[PDB]
Design a binder for this molecule. Sequence first.
Ligand SMILES: [Mg+2]
Ligand SMILES: [Mg+2]
Ligand SMILES: [Mg+2]
Ligand SMILES: [Mg+2]
Ligand SMILES: [Mg+2]
Ligand SMILES: [Mg+2]
Ligand SMILES: [Mg+2]
Ligand SMILES: [Mg+2]
Ligand SMILES: [Mg+2]
Ligand SMILES: [Mg+2]
Ligand SMILES: [Mg+2]
Ligand SMILES: [Mg+2]
Ligand SMILES: [Mg+2]
Ligand SMILES: [Mg+2]
Ligand SMILES: [Mg+2]
Ligand SMILES: [Mg+2]
Ligand SMILES: [Mg+2]
Ligand SMILES: [Zn+2]
Ligand SMILES: [Zn+2]
Lengths: 81, 96, 25, 87, 129, 217, 120, 97, 206
Amino acid sequence: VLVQDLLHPTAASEARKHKLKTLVQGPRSYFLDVKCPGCLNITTVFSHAQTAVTCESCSTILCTPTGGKAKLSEGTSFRRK
Amino acid sequence: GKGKPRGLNSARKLRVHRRNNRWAENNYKKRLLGTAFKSSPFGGSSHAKGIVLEKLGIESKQPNSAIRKCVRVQLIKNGKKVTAFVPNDGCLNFVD
Amino acid sequence: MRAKWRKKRTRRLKRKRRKVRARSK
Amino acid sequence: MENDKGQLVELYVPRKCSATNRIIKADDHASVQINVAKVDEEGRAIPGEYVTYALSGYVRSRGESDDSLNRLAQNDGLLKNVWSYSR
Amino acid sequence: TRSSVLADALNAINNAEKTGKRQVLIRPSSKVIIKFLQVMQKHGYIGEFEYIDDHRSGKIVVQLNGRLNKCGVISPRFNVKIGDIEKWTANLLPARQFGYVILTTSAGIMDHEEARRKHVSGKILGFVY
Amino acid sequence: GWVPVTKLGRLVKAGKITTIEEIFLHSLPVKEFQIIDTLLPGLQDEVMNIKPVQKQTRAGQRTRFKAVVVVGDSNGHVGLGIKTAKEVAGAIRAGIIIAKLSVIPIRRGYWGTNLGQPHSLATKTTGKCGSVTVRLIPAPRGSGIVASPAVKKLLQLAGVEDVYTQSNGKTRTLENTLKAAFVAIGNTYGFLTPNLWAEQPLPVSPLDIYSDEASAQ
Amino acid sequence: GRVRTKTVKRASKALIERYYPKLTLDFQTNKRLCDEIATIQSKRLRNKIAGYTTHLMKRIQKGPVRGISFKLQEEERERKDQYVPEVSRSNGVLNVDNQTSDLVKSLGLKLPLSVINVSA
Amino acid sequence: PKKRASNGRNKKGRGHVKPVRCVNCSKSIPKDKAIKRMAIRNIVEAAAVRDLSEASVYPEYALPKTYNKLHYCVSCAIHARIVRVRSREDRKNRAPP
Amino acid sequence: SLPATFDLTPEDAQLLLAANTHLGARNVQVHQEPYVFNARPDGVHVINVGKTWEKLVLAARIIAAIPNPEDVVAISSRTFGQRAVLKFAAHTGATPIAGRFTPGSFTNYITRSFKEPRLVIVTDPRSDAQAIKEASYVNIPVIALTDLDSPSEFVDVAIPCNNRGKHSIGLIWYLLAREVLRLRGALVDRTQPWSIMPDLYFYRDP
RNA sequence: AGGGGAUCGAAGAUGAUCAGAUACCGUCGUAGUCUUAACCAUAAACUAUGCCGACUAGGGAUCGGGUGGUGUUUUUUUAAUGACCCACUCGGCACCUUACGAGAAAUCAAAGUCUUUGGGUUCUGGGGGGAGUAUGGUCGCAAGGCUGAAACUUAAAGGAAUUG
Ligand SMILES: [Mg+2]
Ligand SMILES: [Mg+2]
Ligand SMILES: [Mg+2]
Ligand SMILES: [Mg+2]
Ligand SMILES: [Mg+2]
Ligand SMILES: [Mg+2]
Ligand SMILES: [Mg+2]
Ligand SMILES: [Mg+2]
Ligand SMILES: [Mg+2]
Ligand SMILES: [Mg+2]
Ligand SMILES: [Mg+2]
Ligand SMILES: [Mg+2]
Ligand SMILES: [Mg+2]
Ligand SMILES: [Mg+2]
Ligand SMILES: [Mg+2]
Ligand SMILES: [Mg+2]
Ligand SMILES: [Mg+2]
Ligand SMILES: [Zn+2]
Ligand SMILES: [Zn+2]
């Protein structure tokens, strides 16, 4: 306070903020390849679905819509990319 | 900004509102209604000449006890009737 | 006198003048 | 504040706050001037010889007196990792 | 709704200075803010500044020295008439020996003294001292 | 005999500080009037106003007397002191002293040309106090002091040859008006202009220099 | 009541302040002391005083009393001053926190180690 | 001028609460402005409890207080109950004992 | 200006972790302190003691730097400070104020408590708030023993420690004394633990 | 205009009190109080404080949403839930402490960023009475609402704070 680097804010105090009040704004959601080992292939899901994402071939389920982040269902794995 | 339009074409509203609000000015409204020419025992003129009816003895307002000596005058251009005061000691003995 | 009793005072007053004036309609 | 020819007319050119470069006027009897000590080898502390800093009454009232001096002294090379320009 | 993007940057700058800061971050920048920002800096009332680039309208970080008492903005951009530029400076500048009224003329955003030398005039928008 | 108390008082009769400019440089809190006496003898007194005030008392009605006094040379130094006492002499006595202690510097200047010896002010300046705002405007030479008799005097005594003035408020209440015209001239060595942008090395404190030739025993 | 006015209590102060050597726990001599050592206008006011300056005297012996400082105490306070022989380097190791440790490792060097965990 | 930031008493963000009827004089009074008190007291009393237990069946029994919430009208609340009137500052303080 | 060996030593650090100077305040934590260092879970915040040790050095580097070491005033209204200050004063120039301060000591010549110092050192600007308030009426620098919840207004240079009681205050005051004698004054070469025990600057009993 | 009409209860009638007592207190109790279908459009309808946008300062609570946690508790076999705990973040109803600042003050995170006087916009006031009166217009079944003067009078009326 009184003199600080507004141009190079620290990654943490930057990280804790709001998605619009960061330096330059950008999302804080993410995508993921997801597999329920009944099948073999990997469907790409949105961390904040809304739509209860219907799996590829087997209409099994996958995730459920929520407040924000989707709840993935039962026995499933992932990765953020 | 509190109130008054600041804009660059808002000159009409700014005059109107002023026209409007001038009326709350005593002497502007007196002037424009012509209160002079209409009410007022004189014409609107500086003096007026009338005729003496009765000689009065007006008693003064408090905290002042006295008798003030006046004349009811009937203005000549008017017949409007008016009581007027007669200054300095005596002087009422001058009129009739 | 209380304001509201005066407001009533003149409410009545207008009713009478409202009345007396009708007489002449 | 010179004049028509040279001549430094008008007295008194006041101190400015080391922290805000604002004037430090007379009735500002809440402003402060700190002397930090020049020293030599193996402790010791060269009397009369100070590195000095001046802080406005405003600043001290606002609580920024410490922090702001931290910066000032440190990047004059007399504090060794205490401050941080980022936050 | 946001009405004069200049107004906000200017006020920010002033509130910072006032509170003893050395930097503002202003939002959302524009051609005009920069040019204004640039004019103050030319006579040293602020340090350097940086345009950061949100893929939007922009942000600006200004560095303040403390040499600045006031930078105001003239909210309706009145026409000034080369004769009437004198009347403005007089109204709202501390003395005739320093401070600038800045204005937008046909041949560029410029403080009144430059405007004088170049013999152009136009609309008025703000001032510094 | 004087006998100072305070470190600063001692240094003065000690002849180790020569001008208040010094005192102002380092913003030294004065506490002893003889300090500004032996520093600036050319000071002359002006009693600005005396008005009765009255307190009601659980056995009495005190009416004591409030006196306003302005002191100064006519060469850059004013004072504004106000004191109420049971007697007018006493009120005026104490007033002058407080007005001594209060003594501030004025930053005069040039209307708008570099010529010989500053005659007006440096910037427009405003002082407020209670409801009165007094606003001082730089004015060309021979304009004079354009202000109501009181404020014209307070200005004169601080040595201002030409300024314009404007006032807002219940100016009739002398006390607050002069107090605002006082704040106005105080505000000249606050307002920072280009000519004062250059950096100064930051002087050494008289109390640290003649530390010895101050101090008690 | 028998509450001594200020003038008595004030004067007793002033006398103990600057004549603690001389003066006694004895009123009778404190009396005579007051004659040589101070002017008073009435026998009554003197004993009234000396009695009380004896009182104050009689209980300085049993600890200080606020309001009276003949310097001889403030120096008694420093020569009556010392203690310690034990400090608080025994035994074993400085016990620290998880992060107090991390504070060490992130600046300094040598330190006996000893961690803990803490709970909500 | 004004005399309390809670104006009368306790209503910021509502417009209308509802009147209760003063337990003493039956004056109507908004529930948030109302001066209330839990009258938790025994059924018996002071020294009657000895006689109580002694001339009863069971051992020691139980003994269950009466509970009833009290609402006062200010004028009533001032005239006897909790109120006094405090200094300009002591007014500000909301802690009970 | 950087010394060379005035780094925070082994035994120094050991001293501070036995005093618990590094235990900063709880769910109370003044905006104006980055003297912190990773929140200890469940309440406490840990204090960067280097920053402490550095501030201490400034402290000394400014105390010594006053021409007459006695008009360098050392105040403490808190009991846990009183025993320390008197001992700080004795060892250095300095004049001591233990217990009650008595207001109007810096303003108002007439007062018999009168002082007029060139610097002030205070142990807890909550309790000693008077002094800090008074000095700002009459331009006087202030040095302060601060916690994570101390009122940094009108004090330049804080010494981020732990007025949560115990030994800290004394510890700090001791080190303070230690470095001002090391500075320009009669003391030593290298480490040299200093004769005087740190428990000499300690609150007593019962 | 129907229905309803327990309760409480303008009016009225009484018992008392009072010099009087058209009242305060006690009783009787019409309308009313509730509801349907229409009117009426006013309250200290209050935060006596327009709305949209920006900026300026600390603190602990709480309400709704969300994110993070090898947090606690629920046991079953660990999870999954749920409630709870801690950190942060949006948007709420408020309080605390300060005041850079504002104010005639009382006080005010707006009543701040105003003689260093301009972000946008709406509305109202211009000494006190006369008087929200007269008059015209208009709306209403009515009661009344909206719009709303003047002559004449007058040196104060008023605000906040202090001492009594
Ligand atoms: Mg009107
Ligand atoms: Mg007649
Ligand atoms: Mg004719
Ligand atoms: Mg007929
Ligand atoms: Mg007069
Ligand atoms: Mg009142
Ligand atoms: Mg009242
Ligand atoms: Mg309502
Ligand atoms: Mg019924
Ligand atoms: Mg009846
Ligand atoms: Mg009867
Ligand atoms: Mg009747
Ligand atoms: Mg209305
Ligand atoms: Mg209300
Ligand atoms: Mg806040
Ligand atoms: Mg969760
Ligand atoms: Mg009169
Ligand atoms: Zn599948
Ligand atoms: Zn009641």
